[PDB]
Amino acid sequence: EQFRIRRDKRARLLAQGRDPYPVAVPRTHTLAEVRAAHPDLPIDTATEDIVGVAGRVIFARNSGKLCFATLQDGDGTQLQVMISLDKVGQAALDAWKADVDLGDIVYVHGAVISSRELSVLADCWRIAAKSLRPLPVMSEESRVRQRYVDLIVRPEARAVARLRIAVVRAIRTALQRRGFLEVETPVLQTLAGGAAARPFATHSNALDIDLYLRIAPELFLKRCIVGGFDKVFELNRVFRNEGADSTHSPEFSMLETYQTYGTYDDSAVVTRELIQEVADEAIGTRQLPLPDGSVYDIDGEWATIQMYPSLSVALGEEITPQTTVDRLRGIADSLGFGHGKLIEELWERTVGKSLSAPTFVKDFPVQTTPLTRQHRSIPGVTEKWDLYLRGIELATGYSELSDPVVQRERFADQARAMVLDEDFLAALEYGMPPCTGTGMGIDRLLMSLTGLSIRETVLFPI
Amino acid sequence: EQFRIRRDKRARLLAQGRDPYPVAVPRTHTLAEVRAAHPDLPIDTATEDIVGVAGRVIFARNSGKLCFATLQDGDGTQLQVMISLDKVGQAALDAWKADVDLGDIVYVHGAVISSRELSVLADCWRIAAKSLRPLPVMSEESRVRQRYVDLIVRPEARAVARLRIAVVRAIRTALQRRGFLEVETPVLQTLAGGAAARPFATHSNALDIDLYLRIAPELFLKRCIVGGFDKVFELNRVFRNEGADSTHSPEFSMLETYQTYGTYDDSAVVTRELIQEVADEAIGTRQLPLPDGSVYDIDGEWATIQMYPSLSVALGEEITPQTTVDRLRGIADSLGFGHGKLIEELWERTVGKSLSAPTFVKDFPVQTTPLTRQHRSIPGVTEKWDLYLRGIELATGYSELSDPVVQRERFADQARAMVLDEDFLAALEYGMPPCTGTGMGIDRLLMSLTGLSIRETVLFPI
Ligand SMILES: COc1nc(N)nc2c1C(=O)N([C@@H]1CCCCC[C@@H]1O)C2
Ligand SMILES: COc1nc(N)nc2c1C(=O)N([C@@H]1CCCCC[C@@H]1O)C2
Ligand SMILES: N[C@@H](CCCC[NH3+])C(=O)O
Ligand SMILES: N[C@@H](CCCC[NH3+])C(=O)O
Secondary structure (H helix, E strand, O other): OHHHHHHHHHHHHHHOOOOOOOOOOOOOOOHHHHHHHOOOOOOOOEEEEEEEEEEEEEEEEEEOOEEEEEEEOOOOOEEEEEEEHHHHOOHHHHHHHHHOOOOOEEEEEEEEEEOOOEEEEEEEEEEEEOOOOOOOOOOHHHHHHOHHHHHHHOHHHHHHHHHHHHHHHHHHHHHHHOOOEEOOOOOEEOOOOOOOOOOOEEEEOOOOEEEEEOOOOHHHHHHHHHOOOOEEEEEEEEEOOOOOEOOEOOEEEEEEEEEEOOOHHHHHHHHHHHHHHHHHHHHOOOEEEOOOOOEEEOOOOOEEEEHHHHHHHHHOOOOOOOOOHHHHHHHHHHHOOOHHHHHHHHHHHHOHHHOOOOEEEEEEEHHHOOOEOEOOOOOOEEEEEEEEEOOEEEEEEEEEOOOHHHHHHHHHHHHHOOOOOHHHHHHHHHOOOOEEEEEEEHHHHHHHHHOOOHHHHOOOOO | OHHHHHHHHHHHHHHOOOOOOOOOOOOOOOHHHHHHHOOOOOOOOEEEEEEEEEEEEEEEEEEOOEEEEEEEOOOOOEEEEEEEHHHHOOHHHHHHHHHOOOOOEEEEEEEEEEOOOEEEEEEEEEEEEOOOOOOOOOOHHHHHHOHHHHHHHOHHHHHHHHHHHHHHHHHHHHHHHOOOEEOOOOOEEOOOOOOOOOOOEEEEOOOOEEEEEOOOOHHHHHHHHHOOOOEEEEEEEEEOOOOOEOOEOOEEEEEEEEEEOOOHHHHHHHHHHHHHHHHHHHHOOOEEEOOOOOEEEOOOOOEEEEHHHHHHHHHOOOOOOOOOHHHHHHHHHHHOOOHHHHHHHHHHHHOHHHOOOOEEEEEEEHHHOOOEOEOOOOOOEEEEEEEEEOOEEEEEEEEEOOOHHHHHHHHHHHHHOOOOOHHHHHHHHHOOOOEEEEEEEHHHHHHHHHOOOHHHHOOOOO
């Protein structure tokens, strides 16, 4: 109902030649600037620094000759204003009382004082924007459908938003320091490769064909390696047309990273440093406070284990690349399609879930890692690692497969379970230097670091 | 045919227990590093700095006991190697001759010398990747279908790639210095607004509905302003499902920028500074050399003109918001749907095309600018500017419309030519502070700056 009373104040403001949505108000300072400016003012004293401030009125308290309000700047910083009859008022004071509702953006020019709390006493004031909706005084799913309100009302929403931003910047900063070049590769592709997922498809009017939103940048990033990029990354959305859960969303921001003349051993080190550097820059500790109340320590060195041996220890018997699917099925049964899949699942069900401290698992089944080079010495496994951090499957790195003939096979096997990515394969046949790539999810990153859900870490999900 | 001879060398290398795609080669330096290290070496003298280098063999010259090759590192830097019988050879020399074709990535450990040109004489050497395709010794449309080869063979492809990267970084650096925060807003939207374009649509399996790839981030970026972001930008792809031409592609990278408590006058200034700063960082001059052979000067201050007056001067009569479509049709006819459209078209046909120096045109027809605030004083126009740089329609800035009721109208008018963006409108009714937004295309930016076509400025178009 207050919807309608607010709409009428708009109408009657227009009519009176007051401007409720003016083009310009001469804001001299953010409220934060005024605070940092007057840190320790003798309380109940005036100073002749005149400012023009603007802010959301989130608290009113009217009292005849004198009205107080809390201006909250968009970052959360607060300044109190005092609308007084004696300063420049009467009609001003009336208009204040009549015109100014909660959630209204307001500008006030005046002197900076402290009251019997840091305030601005007003010479001038003006509405900067009239709200036709009061703030609520929130369920998780209304906070997310209306992030703009969440951000106005809930400090933590403000902090998380800025945290993601700072994390993302930390990442770019870390990679740039190391000489990585950030490239833009295509989102719309004639066929979407680089990972295991069902694509989003869209019809192009230009070309009268379907195109596919990228599931991952790998294959184009690999083209950049062919083309002589020494060190490239890309930090941007990918689209996997599948179901949503606590670690999975159909649209999400992902980092991929490619470095010539290093292996999975090298990118493991960088990934660790990168994450640690992000924590330091964006969180300021490696002793990560959780909503739990607990503390997760990501400092120091991180353990590396091998999938097959670690699984072997867990299961009480030697599991190798040679172990049959009939054997693995049986073990699987005893607990409650193919070899590679069974190993990963058994590993995930036994070793995976038990990991607390940050851990790399390396040396993966060849069948489930089409894009990663075969191990330099161990038969039947690929040089891939996964990083688990706080129990979250965070990141992966590969010693990348550059052999076009092997690579054509790996894809043929895939397809039989038949048009391949011929251009990708062509690029490889021009020669790709030995190189190691990583992938890492930003939401999972933030999750692993903070305890926040995926639906808190993106500004505008659905 | 050489396709097949190369494939056989792979096969016979495998067979002999040589590794043609090894996991790791111990590369100590980039060729650029070795160059910077030995800038002025007395030519035809040896030095006992041992290095391990790796590079693409792009030139061979075999001669009995001694073979020379050019290693080109991926950035374009060149080092010559000398494969000699006397160093560590005979069988080595034979294998070199037999095993190493052009476009092969090769590693060589050895001493750094200058010959009778900076070279490495080899103790050791190894194939790092075997190419199953020779380099061509290129049409514009094969360069772009195979950028990876373009990048190997054509220096200018290398330079342009790195230029775009440096421009994009320059942009982020410039905006960050000014306190802008880069946000990620959704690419997949329930309805795609913020501009005039037909969307790409994609079916979601998760939600069993169509989604729309964003045509622009504005409406979500505006939500961020509501939510208290003072200064936000987003630099990322947008998708407009329309035809391709020399200034238009269906997928392209675009910058949008939002700043609270400034107007179009303010963002005009920033846009100018931003562009000038980009030129300085990424190109190193504001006297822009063109393929033409000419020089385009983007230094100093840029002229601002008004659409209606400038058109009036061009046409020899007063054109105002009040001029009828019947009048404009007639004028249009005399040269060779609605008022706003006719003004822009007439303006573009008369004043637009005649502009050489960098120029802002401001004060636009209300009918064609649904999202921009009405002018503070001039009836019938909005506070929008377009920037033309080197004749290219580069950028725009608005004093943003924050009035939810006016905004609902503007959208209603649009739709009648009927479901609106209710959530966007809801956000506005929570109150958006006065603010100015800009948009700018990266490809157009690069084009305006360099003379390069849109099909050179993106790494992987199609
Ligand atoms: C929300 O994040 C994700 N959403 C989806 N749908 N899928 C994935 C993620 C996500 O974070 N992923 C990681 C990306 C590479 C790093 C290794 C672990 C995962 O594959 C996969
Ligand atoms: C290649 O760049 C573009 N491709 C398409 N399809 N459409 C546009 C571009 C492109 O650069 N645009 C600008 C974006 C905002 C700045 C004002 C001028 C244009 O609208 C529009
Ligand atoms: N494309 C991978 C990430 C890169 C892995 C290293 N080449 C994924 O989506 O899983
Ligand atoms: N969305 C605009 C760019 C931002 C204009 C300022 N609000 C466009 O695509 O034209």
